[PDB]
Symmetry: D2
Subunit: 357 residues, 4 copies
C-alpha cells in the first residue's frame, strides 16, 4: 500500500530558492492550477502548510474543495490558538462539503516568536499538554458525544458538534514531531506519524521508537515521510537542476537561515538542520538524498535527486521500513507535479503504475 501526496505552495513559489528572481506569486488562480493538476494526475492528496508565512490553510482548502473531484486535503490544525469545539465544527463542515476528503495535520508550533504573535506563551511541554487536551476534546465531539472536560489548559462544558463528519470515527489524524512529548502524543492519539527526509537509518530508529510506544498503548500507527524531489530523465540533468535551484543564494544568506532555525524550539527542525552545517559543499548526505533545500527553507530540508530508477529505489527503501505515505514537492510546483507523475508513477505500486497512460 502506498499513498503519494503533493504540496500546495501557500507560502510562495518560483524557480529558485532564496532569490526573488523567477518568483511566482500565490493567487487563487495559481492554487487552482496546482490543485487541479494533482487531482487530474492522480495524487492521493496535497499537504497545505500553516504558519505566519502562509495564507490561511482552512480558507485555501475550502476554496479548492468544490473545484476538485478525488483529491484529498491534508489541512493543519494548531491547538492553543483556537477553541477545540470550533475547530471540530470546521473539520466537520469541510469534511461534509468534500464528501470525506479531509485529512488533519496536528501542528504544535515550533517558533516561539510566532506563537507569541498568536497570543500563546507556552513552554515546549505546555504546548504538548495543550495539544493532548485539544485532541481529546476534538476526537470525542466529532463522534457525537456532548463532551465535559476540565484539564490543566482547556475547559469545556457540554461541547457538541451537531453535524457529524463523513469519515469515521473522525478525519484521520496526521502528526509530525521528534521530541519525547511528540512520540508519546503520536503513539496515543494520532493515526499517521510523519517524519522529514532523514537518511534511511535515522528514520528507521524513529519509526521503531514510535512503534514500540504505540504497542504499550495497544495501538498501531502508520507512517509517512516528507521529501522534496528533483527527478529528470537522466542523472546528469537532475544534479544540474539541484545545483541551479540554489545558485542565487549568497553565503551570507545561508548563515542567516542557519541561525534563524536555532530560535525554533523544535526538535524536528533541530535534526533536519543538523544534517547540513551550512556548507555549500558535500550536500549529498546519502545515496540520492541531497540536503541543499534546507539551506534556506524552513520545514523540509532534503530532496531525492536522480533518475527515475534511482528515485523509485529510495522510495522502496523507505517503504520497506514500513512507510506508506509520501509527501513530495518541487520547484516550481505546477511543472514538477507533472514531472514526477510522468517519470516516477509507472515505477511505483498500484494504482500509481496504471495512472500514467
Amino acid at each position: 500500500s502506498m499513498d503519494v501526496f503533493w504540496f500546495l505552495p501557500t507560502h510562495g513559489d518560483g524557480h529558485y530558492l532564496g532569490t526573488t528572481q523567477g518568483a511566482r506569486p500565490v493567487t487563487l488562480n495559481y492554487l487552482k492550477q496546482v490543485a487541479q493538476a494533482a487531482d487530474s494526475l492522480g495524487y492521493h492528496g496535497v499537504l497545505i502548510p500553516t504558519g505566519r508565512s502562509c495564507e490561511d490553510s482552512w480558507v485555501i482548502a475550502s476554496a479548492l474543495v468544490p473545484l476538485t473531484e478525488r483529491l484529498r486535503y491534508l489541512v493543519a490544525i494548531r491547538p492553543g490558538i483556537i477553541s477545540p469545539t470550533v475547530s471540530a465544527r470546521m473539520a466537520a463542515t469541510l469534511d461534509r462539503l468534500s464528501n470525506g476528503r479531509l485529512l488533519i495535520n496536528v501542528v504544535t508550533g515550533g517558533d516561539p516568536d510566532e506563537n507569541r504573535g498568536d497570543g500563546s506563551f507556552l513552554s515546549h511541554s505546555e504546548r504538548y499538554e495543550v495539544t493532548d487536551e485539544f485532541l481529546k476534546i476534538w476526537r470525542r465531539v466529532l463522534q457525537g458525544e456532548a463532551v465535559d472536560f476540565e484539564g490543566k489548559h482547556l475547559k469545556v462544558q457540554n461541547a457538541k458538534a451537531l453535524y457529524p463528519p463523513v469519515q469515521k470515527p473522525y478525519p484521520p489524524l496526521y502528526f509530525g514531531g521528534s521530541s519525547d512529548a511528540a512520540h508519546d502524543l503520536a503513539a496515543e492519539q494520532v493515526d499517521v506519524y510523519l517524519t522529514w527526509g532523514e537518511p534511511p537509518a535515522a528514520v528507521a530508529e524513529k519509526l521503531a521508537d514510535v512503534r514500540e510506544r504505540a504497542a504499550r498503548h495497544g495501538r498501531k500507527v502508520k507512517f509517512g515521510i516528507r521529501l522534496h524531489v528533483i527527478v529528470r530523465e537522466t542523472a546528469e540533468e537532475a544534479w544540474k537542476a539541484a545545483d541551479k535551484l540554489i545558485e542565487h543564494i549568497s553565503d551570507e544568506t545561508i548563515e542567516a537561515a542557519q541561525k534563524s532555525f536555532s530560535r525554533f524550539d523544535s526538535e524536528g527542525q533541530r535534526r533536519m538542520a543538523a544534517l547540513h552545517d551550512g556548507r555549500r559543499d558535500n550536500l549529498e548526505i546519502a545515496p540520492n538524498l541531497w540536503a541543499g533545500v534546507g539551506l534556506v527553507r524552513g520545514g523540509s530540508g532534503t530532496a531525492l535527486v536522480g533518475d527515475p530508477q534511482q528515485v523509485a529505489a529510495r522510495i522502496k527503501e523507505y517503504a520497506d521500513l514500513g512507510i506508506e505515505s509520501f509527501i513530495f514537492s518541487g520547484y516550481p510546483h505546477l511543472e514538477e507535479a507533472y514531472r514526477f507523475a510522468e517519470l516516477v508513477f509507472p515505477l511505483l505500486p498500484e494504482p500509481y503504475a496504471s495512472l500514467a497512460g
Copy 2:
C-alpha cells in the same frame, strides 16, 4: 445609496416553521444555488449566520467565493474563541481570494450555554472587554503594524499579518448590539451598526444614540437593519403566506403597519418581517431609509425561491442600481 443583502441558510431551510415537513437540508449544492442566485440577481451580498446550529461560516464562505463574481460575504468572527492574529490572517486570505468581497460581522455570543461549550467562561461585561481588545489588535495587524498588546484579556507580542488585504484599511466591520457597551464599541471601532426589525420609532432612537456617541469620537457610522420579507403581488396573498408559514405552531402578531413578528416564534433568522404587496414593502423600506439606514439584510422561506421573488417584485421600486437590474 442602498445595499440590499440576502441570507444564506447555513442552519437549514424549509417551507414552514416548527415542522420538519418540507425541510431542505443544508448541502454544498443547495448553498451554491442560493449564493449563485443572489450573485446573478444583483444582491450586494449575503449574510452568513454563525453558531452551534450552523455549519462553519468560514468554510462555507471560502467554498462559495470562487463560484461567484460580485456577491459579497458578511462572515462572522467571534472574539474569545480564536486568536485575533489568526482571525486576521483568515480575513486577509478570504479578502484576497475574493478580490475584496469580504465583510466582517462582529459577534460576541449571546448564549452562555453555547459559549461554555466553546471554552469561554466570561460574563456579559467581560465579553465586550474581550471584543474591544480583539478588534484593536485585529484592525492594527491588518494595517501592516507589528502589534505589541497586553490588555486585561488578550496579550500578543510581534503580531503580524504578512499578506495585506484588498479592502483598505481592512474589511468593513458590521456589528449589532443594544447594550451601552455595544453602542460605545460601535461608536469607536465599527463601520456599520446593525439593528433588528423594530418599529420605526424604536429604530430612530437607537440610531440617534449611536450617532451621538460616534460624533464624540469624530467619526460617522452607517446603519443597517435585518428583516424577513414576505412579499407577493397583492396584499391578500402576502398575509395568507404568513399564516401558512406558521400553521404547524402551538399556542395579534402585527406590531406595526406591515411589520409582522411571526417569524420570531422560533429561533430562526430574525424576529420581524415585512408583509405586504410591492408598494407596501418598498414604502416601509423607504421609511427606514429616511432614518439613516443604508444596509438591508433580507431573508425568506425558502431562501432560493424568495430571493427571486423579492428581486423581481421590489427591486424595480428601490433606488439604483436595483432599478436597472430587473431588465
Copy 3:
C-alpha cells in the same frame, strides 16, 4: 424502470404565457441555475430544445457539462443542415467530456419557413430520406468504421470519427414524430420513441403502431412522453395556478399564434392543435390533462394539473402503457423543478422515492 427529465428553457422563461410580464431572460447564470438544480435534485437529465427561437443547443449543453456531476443532456441534432460526420464528432467530443452523459434527440424540422432559413428546401418525405441517410452514417462512424455511403441526398467517402464515444454503441437516440415516415424511421433506427402529452388512449395506439413496426425490423424500442406539469399541495391550488398561467391571453393572439401552427409541416403539431382549436373554454381534455399551454406555445401543449396523488396517478397510467421516460417542465422552470421534485418524487418508483 423510469427516467424523469426536466427542461432547460432556452426559449426564454417567465411566470405567464403570452405577455412579457414576469419574464425571465435566458442567461448563462440562469441556465446554470436550472441545470444545477436538476442535477442536485436527482433528475435523470434535461431536454434542450432547438430552433430559430432558441439559443444553440450544442453551445449550451457543452457549457453546462463541466458544471454538473450526474445530470444527462438530451441534445438535438438536425439532419439536412449539418454534415453527419461533423455531427458525429461533436457527439463524441461532448460524450467524452461528460463521461457518458450525452443523449441525442433527432429533430427533422417541422417549420418549412425556418428550414428555408437554414438553406434546406425539402418536402416532408425528403426530410425523412435525408434523416434516414444521416442516421445510417452517424451510427456507423461512431462505431469505428471508415464509412463509404452514396445515397439520394448524402454522400461520404472515408468518413471517420477518430475519437470513440463513451456510451456504446453510441449516445442513445431519442426521436419524436407522428407521421408515417416518422414511425418507420423510429422503428428502424432510434432507441426511444417520444410523444407529446395526448390522452392515454391516443398514446397507446401510437405506441402500438411503433411497437408493431419495430418487430418487423427485429427490434424493440422504449417509449417516452413530454408533458408540462402544474402540481400544488391541493387540487384547488393547482387549477388556480393553471388559470393564472393563461390569464393575459387575448383572443387575437390565440389566432395569431395558433394559425402559425397551421403553416407547420408537422403531424405532431397538427394533432396537438387539434385538442383545443383556439377555444379557451373546456381545456381539460382528460382527467387532470389540461391543454391550455398549447394556446400560444408550440411543441408540448398539455400539462398534468392536480395534487401530488392525482399527478402521480396519471404518470402511473402512462407507465402501464410502456412509457419509461418522462420529460417534464414548468413555469417558471427553476421554482417548478423543486416543486415537482419535492411533491411528486416521493410518490414515484425508486430511485426518486428515496432521493429526499
Copy 4:
C-alpha cells in the same frame, strides 16, 4: 497594439515529436489546465485547431468559456459542412455566454480526403466560392438582416438570427490562405489575415499583396502570424531542446532564429522561433514592424511552455504584456 495568443492542443500533446514517449492525451482536465493557464497569465486568447484529428472545437470552446474570465477563444468555422444560418446562431450564443470573448477563424480545408469524408466534393476554386457565399450570409444575419441569398452553392430564404451577438458588427473574422482566391477573399470580407511563420522577406510580400487588394475595395485589414516557440534562458538550452524534440524521426535553420524542425510532422505551425528572450523578442519586433499585430504562439508541452513564454518574453513585449509579470 499587439495580441499574443496561445494554443489549445486539441489534437494531442507531449514532450517529443514522432514518438509516443512522453505523450499527454487530450482530456477535459488537461484542456482546462492549458486554458486556465493562458487566462491567468494574461494571454489575449487561444487558437483552437479544427479537423479530423481534433476533438470538436465548438464543444471544447463552449465547455471552457464558463471556467475562464478574460481569455478569448479563436474557434474555427468550416463552410461547406454546416449551414451558415446555423453557424451564426452558434457564434451568437457562444459570444453572448462569453460576454464578447469569441473570435472566428474561417477555415476552407486543404485536405481533400478529409473533405470527402465530411460530404464535400468541391475543387479548390469551388471551396472559396462557397466560403465567399458563406461569409456574406453569415455576416449579414449576425447584423440583424433578414437575408435572401441565391448563389452558385448556397441558397437561403428569410434567414434570421434572433439573438444578436455582443461584439459589433460581429465577432472578428480571422483568415489564412496563400492562393489568389484566398487573398481576394481576405481583402473583401475578413478582419485579420493570418500567415505562417515564413522569414520576414516572405511575410512582407504576402502582407503587401493582401493590403494592396484591400485598398481597392476601400477596406483595411490587420495581420497576424502563427509561430511555434522554443525559448529558454540561454540560446544553448533552446537549441538543445530543439534537438531533443525531433530526435526520434527518420540543416534546418532557414533564417536567423527561424527553425523549421517542427514542420517535419503536422501539428500546428511549421517553423519556430528558437533562442533566448532577447533573440525571440527581437524577431517579434521584426515581424511587428511589418504590420503584424496578432501573434499565435505554441510550445511542447503546451502547459509548461505557456508559463515559460509568459515569464521570459512578456516583460520584453509592449504593454499590457510588460506589466503583467508583476
